[PDB]
Amino acid sequence: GALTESQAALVKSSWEEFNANIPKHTHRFFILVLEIAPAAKDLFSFLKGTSEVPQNNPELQAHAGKVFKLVYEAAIQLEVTGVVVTDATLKNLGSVHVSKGVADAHFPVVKEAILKTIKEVVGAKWSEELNSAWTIAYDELAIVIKKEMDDAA
Numbered sequence: 764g765a766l767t768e769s770q771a772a773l774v775k776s777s778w779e780e781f782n783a784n785i786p787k788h789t790h791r792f793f794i795l796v797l798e799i800a801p802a803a804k805d806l807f808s809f810l811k812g813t814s815e816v817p818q819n820n821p822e823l824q825a826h827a828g829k830v831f832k833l834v835y836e837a838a839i840q841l842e843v844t845g846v847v848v849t850d851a852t853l854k855n856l857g858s859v860h861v862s863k864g865v866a867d868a869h870f871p872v873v874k875e876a877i878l879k880t881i882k883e884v885v886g887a888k889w890s891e892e893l894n895s896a897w898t899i900a901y902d903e904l905a906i907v908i909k910k911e912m913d914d915a916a
């Protein structure tokens with residue numbers, strides 16, 4: 764699909780819609796994760812020793828917000844520039860995943876959890892053109908982090 768001026772316009776628009784409700788979209792996102800893979804729970808400090816996914820845990824919200832922002836920034840960068848740029852942050856990201864016991868096969872878990880989360884976020888405006896656009900942007904960003912984990916291990 765490439766990332767036409769028209770496709771980028773579509774991701775920006777849909778991320779603005781996501782940020783618009785962090786405590787919801789982020790707790791949803793963690794539930795979609797634990798649905799696709801239950802075992803994932805022991806990983807998260809703020810999920811350990813608990814039984815259910817905490818709903819007002821600042822640690823949890825701050826965490827999940829950061830995740831989506833990063834995927835959107837990635838899509839704009841693709842339309843303007845044609846690429847996703849690797850910086851200090853993406854590199855430190857790779858380190859912390861590894862400390863915490865996260866692997867590659869965990870990534871389609873968090874992807875589907877994000878496509879499903881955005882399909883839920885944009886509702887009837889959903890188009891093939893839009894699905895195509897977030898898919899392109901995640902894929903392109905995951906490619907970059909997975910790269911940095913391998914390097915932190």
Ligand code: HEM
Nearest residue numbers: 803806807808825826829830833863865869870873904905
């Ligand atoms: C493009 C996709 C992804 C992005 C942009 C991303 C981003 C991040 C960021 C920014 C942090 C640190 C947050 C903080 O300091 O507060 C973090 C921590 C973490 N992430 Fe990810 N992530 C991605 C995929 C994944 C996957 C697939 C898993 C595995 C299930 C995972 C598991 C974790 C864990 C266990 C921590 C440590 C949390 C702690 O115990 O406090 N992430 N991630």
Ligand SMILES: [F-]
Nearest residue numbers: 826827830873
């Ligand atoms: F994460």
